[PDB]
Design a protein around this ligand. Structure first.
Ligand SMILES: [Mg+2]
Ligand SMILES: [Mg+2]
Lengths: 51, 88, 51, 52, 133, 237
RNA sequence: AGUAGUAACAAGA
RNA sequence: CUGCUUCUGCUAU
RNA sequence: AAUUAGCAGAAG
C-alpha cells in the first residue's frame, strides 16, 4: 500500500501478459509537496549519467 | 577430541521425514562415491560437461589398468574389474 | 534443473550461465510446464490431549 | 556538512530507472549483452508479491 | 616459537598516529599468488587429476618434488594437507592500522605492539631479511 | 556432406566428434568440414588400435576377429583423443606419472605401452613432410609422430611401429574417403576457407520481449524507441 | 492469568 | 516462516 | 612502491 501510495499519480494500466494492475510512476508529474515521490524524470537521470 | 560434530537433527513435530531423508541420502551417496573416485573434488571444483558415471567409469578403468601392470592387482582381480566395468 | 529437463530445456548441461539464462527465458514461452512437486499424506493417529 | 538519510529507499526507487541505467551504461557492448543486462529490471518491474 | 624466543622492551605512554595500510598478517617463505599456489598444491597432492601443465610447474618443481618427498607415506585426509599447504604458501594481506612496524613478524603481535595512546617495544624471534633492514 | 557423415561413419565416432567440437565452443552446422576432419582423425586413431593385444609376457600379438574377449585383456594402445578434456588429461597424466616419464605440454592422441611413448596422429591433405616438420617445432622431441595423407604418403618419427598391412588399411581408408568426397562433389566443400567470426548468441523469446515493451517509462511505446532515445539524444540542460 | 506488543505462545510447527 | 550486498573472523564439517 | 566454499558478527 505504501509503495503504491507514492506512485498512484502515474500511469495505471493492466498488463496483458499476466493480468496484473501495473503502475508507471516514471516520467510522471513533478511532486507538489514534501511527501515521498517516486516519479523519477528520465531526462534528469540521463543527464546525471552524462555528467 | 574437542573438534566433535553436533548433528542438528532437524525433525519437525508430527512430520515423518522418510522420503526427504532418502533423496538427500541418495545425493550424498552419489557424491561420496564420486569423491572416492576423484580425490580433489573438495579442493578444486571439477569441470566437465559429461556424465558422472562416464567420468567415474573412465577413472576406474584407467586405475585398474595401472594397478595391474605395476603388480598391485592380480590377473583374476583385473578380470573381475573389467568384467564389472563391461556391465556398466 | 531437474524440472527443466522434463520440458526439454537441457541448456544446464552446457556448463555455463548464459545457456541457463537462455533456458530461463525459453521457459516463459512454454504452453505448459511440468515439474516435481511435493505433497503429503495427513495420517490420523490416536493421542491423549485436548483435541 | 549534512548528515543525512533517505526515507523510503526501497519504496520509491523504480526498476524502470534501472532499465534505463543499464541501457545507458552498456552503450557500447554487443547487442546480446545489452539484452542480457536489460532482462533483470524488466523482471523487477513485473514482480508479484506473495502475501505471507 | 617466534614468541617464546622473543624479548620484550618497554612500554611508553604517549600519542601514536596510526595509518591504515594493507599489510601481510603472517610470515611466509615462498609467497605465491593463490591461483599459482592452488596449481602447485594440485601438483603436490593430486598429481593425476592436475590439469594442464602451466608455467607454475616449471619454476616450482623443486618445491613440488621436495614436498612430495616429505608427504610420501602419510595417512592424513588430503584436504587437510591441502589447507596446511595453502597456509604455508598463500599470503593474506589485510587493511590494518599500523604505526612504525609493518613487517609480518610485527603484525602478528600488533595487538600488544601499540595502541592509540601507548607503544610497547618488541624484538621478535626467528630470522629477518636484509630487504626489510 | 552431413548425410555422407551419418551414412558412412559409425554412431560413437560421430558423437565423440560432436562433443569434441562443442568442447571448443563451436557448432557442427557452421563447419561441417571440421566435423569430417575430426571424424576421419578419430577413425584412423581407432584403426591403429583395432585388434592389437598383449599376452601375459607383454608382447604385441594381433588376434582374430569374432573371438572370445577373455583371452584378450590388455590392448596395446591407449586412445586419448576422442575423450573429453578432463578425462583425456587425467589419462595422460596417469600414464605419465605411472611409467615415471614426463608429461608433455600438449594432449597427445595415443599412448604406446610397449614403447612407453606418446604418439600424435595427423592426417594432412598434401605433403606429409611439411606437416611433419611443422609439428616438430611445437612438440620437438616429446612425442612420436604418425602423419598420413590422402595421396598415399606417410611421415613417421625415428621409431616406426605400424606394419605395412595396417598402413595399407589406413591409406586405403583415406583414398576411399577421397574417392567418395570427390564423387559426390564434396571436396570443394571441404577445401574452401569458410572463415566465420562468432560470438555469444543470446536471443530473447516472445514473452520477455512483450514484458520489456510494457516496462518502459511514460512517453514511450516499445523498447526499440526507448533504446534509440537513450542512445541518440543529448539530454544536457 | 501471564510474557509481552500492531501478533503470537500459554504443547502438537 | 530468517532475503541481498560489503567487510572481518574461524573452519574445511 | 606492489602483491575455493560454509557459518557467525556488524553496517547498509
Ligand atoms: Mg546516515
Ligand atoms: Mg590431438
Amino acid at each position: 500500500i505504501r509503495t503504491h501510495e507514492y506512485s498512484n499519480k502515474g500511469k495505471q494500466y493492466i498488463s496483458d501478459v499476466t493480468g496484473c494492475t501495473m503502475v508507471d510512476p516514471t516520467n510522471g508529474p513533478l511532486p507538489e509537496d514534501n511527501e515521498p515521490s517516486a516519479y523519477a524524470q528520465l531526462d534528469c537521470v540521463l543527464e546525471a549519467l552524462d555528467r | 577430541t574437542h573438534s566433535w560434530r553436533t548433528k542438528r537433527n532437524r525433525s519437525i513435530l508430527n512430520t515423518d521425514q522418510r522420503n526427504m531423508i532418502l533423496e538427500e541420502q541418495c545425493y550424498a551417496k552419489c557424491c561420496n562415491l564420486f569423491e572416492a573416485c576423484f580425490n580433489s573434488a573438495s579442493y578444486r571444483k571439477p569441470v566437465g560437461q559429461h556424465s558422472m558415471l562416464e567420468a567415474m567409469a573412465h577413472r576406474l578403468r584407467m586405475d585398474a589398468r595401472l594397478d595391474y601392470e605395476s603388480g598391485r592387482m592380480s590377473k583374476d582381480d583385473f578380470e573381475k574389474a573389467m568384467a564389472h566395468l563391461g556391465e556398466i | 534443473i531437474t524440472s527443466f529437463r522434463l520440458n526439454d530445456l537441457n541448456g544446464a548441461d552446457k556448463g555455463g550461465l548464459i545457456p541457463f539464462c537462455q533456458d530461463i527465458i525459453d521457459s516463459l514461452d512454454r504452453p505448459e510446464m511440468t515439474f516435481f512437486s511435493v505433497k503429503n499424506i495427513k495420517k490420523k493417529l490416536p493421542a491423549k490431549n485436548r483435541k | 556538512t549534512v548528515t543525512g538519510d533517505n526515507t523510503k529507499w526501497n519504496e520509491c526507487l523504480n526498476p524502470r530507472i534501472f532499465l534505463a541505467m543499464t541501457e545507458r551504461i552498456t552503450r557500447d557492448s554487443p547487442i546480446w549483452f545489452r539484452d542480457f543486462c536489460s532482462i533483470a529490471p524488466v523482471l523487477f518491474s513485473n514482480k508479484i508479491a506473495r502475501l505471507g | 616459537m617466534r614468541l617464546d624466543n622473543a624479548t620484550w622492551g618497554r612500554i611508553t605512554f604517549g600519542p601514536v598516529e596510526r595509518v591504515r595500510k594493507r599489510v601481510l598478517l603472517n610470515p611466509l617463505t615462498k609467497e605465491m599468488p593463490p591461483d599459482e599456489a592452488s596449481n602447485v598444491i594440485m601438483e603436490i597432492l593430486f598429481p593425476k587429476e592436475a590439469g594442464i601443465p602451466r608455467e607454475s610447474t616449471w619454476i616450482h618443481r623443486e618445491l613440488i618434488k621436495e614436498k612430495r618427498e616429505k608427504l610420501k607415506g602419510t595417512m592424513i585426509t588430503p584436504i587437510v594437507l591441502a589447507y596446511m599447504l595453502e597456509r604455508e604458501l598463500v599470503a593474506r594481506r589485510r587493511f590494518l592500522p599500523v604505526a612504525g612496524a609493518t613487517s609480518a613478524e610485527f603484525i602478528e603481535m600488533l595487538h600488544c605492539l601499540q595502541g592509540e595512546n601507548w607503544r610497547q617495544i618488541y624484538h621478535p624471534g626467528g630470522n629477518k631479511l636484509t630487504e626489510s633492514r | 556432406m552431413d548425410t555422407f557423415i551419418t551414412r558412412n561413419f559409425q554412431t560413437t565416432i560421430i558423437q565423440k566428434a560432436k562433443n569434441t567440437m562443442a568442447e571448443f565452443s563451436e557448432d557442427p552446422e557452421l563447419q561441417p568440414a571440421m566435423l569430417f576432419n575430426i571424424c576421419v582423425h578419430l577413425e584412423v586413431c581407432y584403426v591403429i588400435s583395432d585388434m592389437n593385444f598383449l599376452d601375459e609376457e607383454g608382447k604385441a600379438y594381433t588376434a582374430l576377429e569374432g573371438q572370445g574377449k577373455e583371452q584378450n585383456l590388455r590392448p596395446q594402445y591407449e586412445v586419448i583423443e576422442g575423450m573429453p578434456r578432463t578425462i583425456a588429461w587425467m589419462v595422460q597424466r596417469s600414464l605419465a606419472q605411472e611409467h615415471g616419464i614426463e608429461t608433455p605440454k600438449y594432449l597427445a592422441d595415443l599412448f604406446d605401452y610397449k614403447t612407453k611413448r606418446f604418439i600424435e596422429v595427423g592426417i594432412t591433405k598434401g605433403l606429409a613432410d611439411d606437416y611433419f616438420w611443422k609439428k616438430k617445432e611445437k612438440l620437438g622431441n616429446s612425442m612420436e609422430l604418425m602423419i598420413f595423407s590422402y595421396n598415399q604418403d606417410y611421415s613417421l618419427s625415428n621409431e616406426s611401429s605400424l606394419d605395412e598391412e595396417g598402413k595399407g588399411r589406413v591409406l586405403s581408408r583415406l583414398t576411399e574417403l577421397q574417392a567418395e568426397l570427390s564423387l559426390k562433389n564434396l571436396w570443394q566443400v571441404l577445401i574452401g576457407e569458410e572463415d566465420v567470426e562468432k560470438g555469444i548468441d543470446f536471443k530473447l523469446g516472445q514473452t520477455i520481449s512483450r514484458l520489456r515493451d510494457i516496462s518502459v517509462p511514460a512517453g514511450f511505446s516499445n523498447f526499440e524507441g526507448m533504446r534509440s532515445y537513450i542512445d541518440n539524444i543529448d539530454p544536457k540542460g
